Amino acid sequence: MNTPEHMTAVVQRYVAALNAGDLDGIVALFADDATVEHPVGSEPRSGTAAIREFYANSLKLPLAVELTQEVRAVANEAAFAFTVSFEYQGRKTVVAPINHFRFNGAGKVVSMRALFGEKNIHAGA
Amino acid sequence: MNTPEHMTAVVQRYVAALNAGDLDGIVALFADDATVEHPVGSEPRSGTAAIREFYANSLKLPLAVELTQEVRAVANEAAFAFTVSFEYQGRKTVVAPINHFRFNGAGKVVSMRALFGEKNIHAG
Ligand SMILES: C[C@]12CCc3c(ccc4cc(O)ccc34)[C@@H]1CCC2=O
Ligand SMILES: C[C@]12CCc3c(ccc4cc(O)ccc34)[C@@H]1CCC2=O
């Protein structure tokens, strides 16, 4: 099994990597054949190239990402509450998702699902 | 597809029914063919009779429950952060899971999963 400490560390490193604008850092958390599903209910992005593309696009704006509560880690899975803040043309957005990671045997992430809706996107005006 | 309003209010009723020790009310939120998996990793209890006994058992001690952040609701799913507290034999325990609901076409919860580890169980 994965250890909860390893999963929690991966979640923390993922946030730090977002904050550092570190694309290779993020992508390396993932399995070769992982999936990102963003938002929940959309067609999952699949494989390294599509994952790299999703995060490359995500990082076009400077992000302030913040783990808002302790990570919840059990078996081969982790879930976490966080915020992602950004600003474009003088307009602030704070999104509050809850994300879910499944890990494989090697301790790599095999799926990401980002669960959030419109009521979780918060504007500055 | 379910409304985020509806999935959100269901999360509120759930928390309320836990606080109220209102067993019938927790159970009515779930579909006939729902399953509950608590903690993620265990064998899912399945169907109305097994779900009721799951709650009946948890409700042997009075539960103090509260959402610690906004609900997230999208597509047919909601996820929520919360603490659940109880007191037995002179010890207070606080657990902080994140739960995940899937809803069916008719607005009932057809799947629940409680995500928490040892580090989310707190002994004061
Ligand atoms: C600034 C601008 C008009 C307004 C505007 C632009 C780009 C992004 C924006 C984002 C906003 O949230 C509000 C206004 C703009 C244009 C780019 C060039 C231009 O004239
Ligand atoms: C299962 C639960 C979340 C976790 C939890 C509950 C009750 C007692 C518990 C006791 C524990 O040692 C660990 C976790 C729980 C809640 C009852 C309803 C609910 O959603």
Side-chain angles (χ1 to χ4, degrees):
Chain A
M1 211 175 59
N2 273 280
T3 72
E5 298 90 341
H6 168 71
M7 290 195 291
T8 291
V10 173
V11 171
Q12 299 153 347
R13 289 160 202 176
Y14 173 79
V15 162
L18 288 156
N19 284 333
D22 180 352
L23 179 54
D24 291 344
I26 299 180
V27 172
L29 301 182
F30 289 79
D32 277 352
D33 55 350
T35 59
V36 177
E37 177 175 340
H38 173 285
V40 162
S42 69
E43 173 78 18
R45 287 151 183 109
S46 178
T48 304
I51 305 287
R52 169 173 278 99
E53 164 78 355
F54 171 70
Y55 288 101
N57 294 340
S58 302
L59 293 190
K60 287 185 163 179
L61 298 180
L63 296 191
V65 172
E66 160 168 292
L67 211 45
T68 202
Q69 281 185 0
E70 57 195 77
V71 180
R72 270 66 160 198
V74 277
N76 290 307
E77 275 180 59
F80 62 103
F82 61 113
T83 63
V84 179
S85 305
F86 56 95
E87 186 183 340
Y88 178 64
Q89 304 289 268
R91 292 178 69 259
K92 302 187 170 193
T93 302
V94 181
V95 184
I98 292 171
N99 279 21
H100 184 229
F101 282 169
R102 300 185 201 110
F103 297 70
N104 61 4
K108 298 306 190 176
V109 185
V110 278
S111 54
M112 179 279 229
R113 301 178 64 107
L115 211 166
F116 65 92
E118 177 73 27
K119 300 284 273 134
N120 312 117
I121 298 154
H122 307 274
Chain B
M1 168 149 320
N2 283 271
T3 82
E5 289 77 0
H6 169 72
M7 308 202 157
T8 300
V10 168
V11 176
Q12 287 156 9
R13 305 189 221 293
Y14 184 71
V15 173
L18 283 164
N19 283 312
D22 168 18
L23 175 59
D24 282 351
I26 296 166
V27 165
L29 296 180
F30 281 88
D32 284 342
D33 59 346
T35 62
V36 179
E37 192 190 327
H38 173 276
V40 279
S42 31
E43 172 85 295
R45 288 149 162 279
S46 153
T48 299
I51 285 163
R52 156 175 290 262
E53 180 85 323
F54 174 84
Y55 288 105
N57 289 347
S58 297
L59 281 177
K60 290 315 174 46
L61 315 174
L63 299 180
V65 179
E66 68 191 57
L67 292 174
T68 47
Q69 287 189 347
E70 57 207 81
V71 180
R72 283 63 155 187
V74 67
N76 289 301
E77 293 172 52
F80 54 100
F82 68 105
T83 50
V84 49
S85 291
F86 45 90
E87 298 266 341
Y88 187 64
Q89 298 283 337
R91 201 186 204 192
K92 182 169 172 192
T93 294
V94 174
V95 179
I98 290 163
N99 271 16
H100 169 288
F101 279 169
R102 192 175 102 254
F103 293 70
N104 67 21
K108 303 297 181 170
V109 178
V110 59
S111 188
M112 181 179 97
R113 291 180 95 240
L115 221 53
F116 62 92
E118 207 52 36
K119 178 113 184 201
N120 313 108
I121 299 184
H122 318 264

